[PDB]
């Protein structure tokens, strides 16, 4: 709202180039003032004409020429912010700052949004914020400052003409105040619509395989076309709403500038005003009427910049999970839960209710249970996905909240259920866990995950490009690449969540070989519905409806009839399809 | 090929109307300046009389000028909105009609860039330049004639100013050549990096600790900023010169010095000079608004070239015979397939097998064998290099897309949910489906129990990829979505993964009770599913190595014996 807040937002958004932006705007303002002065030089020049006084005609023509030269050089230098790389540098710095904020925002709240919606902010909102600042500044300074200076100098030439020329600038204020809420609402609505459309388009692209199956012409794509038509109707309605206001503003401005000339003509025929000064004023007005009529329309870009700044600051206002009473590196790696009860956002589940457990160091523990029990919740809260409302989780004797996210992510290496590969080469996909590793170490990690076989069968070798989500690889190959990625990173705690869902029996045994090798010197947490792989665990934790119902080892759990025994019987139970 | 002229074809009538009204407004503005110059001349000749008729002429011409300008701008804006809608709809339809492999390779970030940002860039051009183009082509052409009729020497001077500006602008043309490809690739890579950063945040935070934010995102940002700096430097001179040569000050400077020279030569006419000064805004100041948006118009031109490059991609050879299947039986005849990426060997070498209707065919083999490959080829993901895939005797190539997809209900290996509602996700492709059918389909699977447990029930919201829902729960939702269709062949790609054995057994028994005569294609690594099936097909290294029942393949003593023995020893 307040222009001071808008100014400080713009300065913050520009960042290190704030002084360059201020200097460029000062140059543009000086150029507008000097252009107004140059127009003011017409009054003696036209008075020099009609009389033939060549000496002072040249004397004032030199002044006009130097004024025009200063105006041209000032505008050329002030517009360099767009073309000398300062705008690009500011955009790059803003993108870097926004990207870092993505790295620090709580992951739970971030997952409540959409990737396409965030794409419209880090990419589109930035260009709406910065790409038109210099141009809009140049247009508004030309629109207002130059005619203002011309009228102020007319006041020196003729106080009656100057006063009536100046009387239009107060007239623009009520129209601007009347039209500002409409422009603000229109810009906000268009921004929200564009963000929603970006999210919908990204989701539509990411699910073309599912969409093609349903068929029936277009059903979800029918919703996409409905969104397109709704955007068209929104834009058309907004334009129609402001068309009458724009017509009224243009009429009022251009006819208030058409009564200045009439008053000057009346004064001239009355004999109290010089005809040459009248011609100079008329030339100024005719060269000023068109830009001044649509000054309010020009303020729409300022409203757009303000809306982009507001969206960017709202995104940047998200606070990270507090790091209270910062501590040092834990020396043991025995994860302990203590009365942990976690509730998901917008979820009444109260999952992981009053859960207390222990993950001994230099051992391997397993989590079993039904789908939705809360094992992935345990894995996520161990990575500080969200703060527990009750209970404490400690890597060693140190609570997670006493650590910064960097340290915790350094102590944790995870194979995720949702296997995610990066859109680059396989070598870099494995190496991102620990880039400062020897190629022999990378090959050893690949061998441990039993993935060198199909890497050898890759014509591009390790340089084979991986598509979005690692599409070019199979599910098992991608999952083994993720396993190798986690293996390459040397972390005290290794959390694997269903490591072998998409692996065959031989590949799964080969992977379990390295998993068992990991046990001796690393804390290992393993999630598995294939109970055969995790039968050898030192401890097995049974989860049901967010509670750890039963504890024990493979022999101990199978000795007493419980949920683990029932799960093993179901796994061993034959499956009948009846033809 | 004039891309700017090409894009306005769907809204050509309205664009031409805007051009015509802008030209009419320009001519009316010239008339206003002529009437006002006549008023000044009358005042000069008679310093005691009001030029009432010329003043009425100038005020009326001013009124018509701004009315026509505003109406033309409104027409241009409506045409721009209509063109944006048409282009976005055409892009969405092309994306639907594009082959799945081509669209997957091009990327979701590229789709977001072309569909949203490139179409958005059309607004600047269509709604804010075509009236300005019309003004810049109308005012100078009439103004030069008017000034030659008025005073040919000042006309020559101002025409020389305009010619100097135009010649300098034409000489300095970057042409946007040999760098459009890099500009695009940088733009879509930045978009894809942002999307990848957002959707893979747990992996980024866990592993990518080397760089603040995300490393690939940083690399893309640096490439984009290099491209932007190069583009801005290459276009700086033309833009800044057009901003200083089309300013009123150069024209006024030349006119004033020419008038002084004429006074020195004893041939200066005051009224003609005044009328030239009033009318001189039409030659060089008319092109000024267009050059204020020339750079954004160049960006729009690049985006237009990208859009029309996207629309120029080949489709998946749709036929016109429209033959129908009548058997619901699958046949692979010596099919060989290579993915667009030039992988060594082949995904499939000589695959050939017949699955008659009603058969519970189970697909087994090690990872990378090509089970998902044959499933995708059945789904018309691409076309086989050799052989033929047929459903009910008729080839897939000899089918309409609707005809082929009315045959197969497919459960993908990757479980994707379109956010939205669980009930909406299950009823995808048919919003009119009653909730009773959705609940029945979820009861065929095991999703209904956990769905009822959720507080909003079926109307529970799920994340962009289904992140608000468990992996096993997400797969159950996808299974229910496929089952709601009731299509003749049901293909599953590891549908019982991410699930505990109790849920797996319940799903198997319920689905066996459900797909009684339906042909069921099964991809499963858990061999407990395939121990009782109508036929088992084993793939290894892209070759169909074995085919038969569990007993048959066990007695054969081949690749299936080792797999089954290892699986049984494990459990
Ligand atoms: Mg999970
Ligand atoms: Mg697969």
Author numbering:
A (entry chain B): 10 to 588
B (entry chain A): 13 to 583
Quote the study on this structure.
Initially discovered in Yersinia enterocolitica, Ybt is a virulence-associated siderophore molecule synthesized in many pathogens such as UPEC. The metal-chelated Ybt is then imported back into the bacteria through the outer membrane importer FyuA and inner membrane ABC importer YbtPQ. In YbtPQ, TMD1 is formed by four TMs from YbtP (TM1~3, TM6) and 2 TMs from YbtQ (TM4, TM5), while TMD2 is formed by four TMs from YbtQ (TM1~3, TM6) and 2 TMs from YbtP (TM4, TM5), a typical swap of helices (subunit intertwining) in type IV ABC exporters.
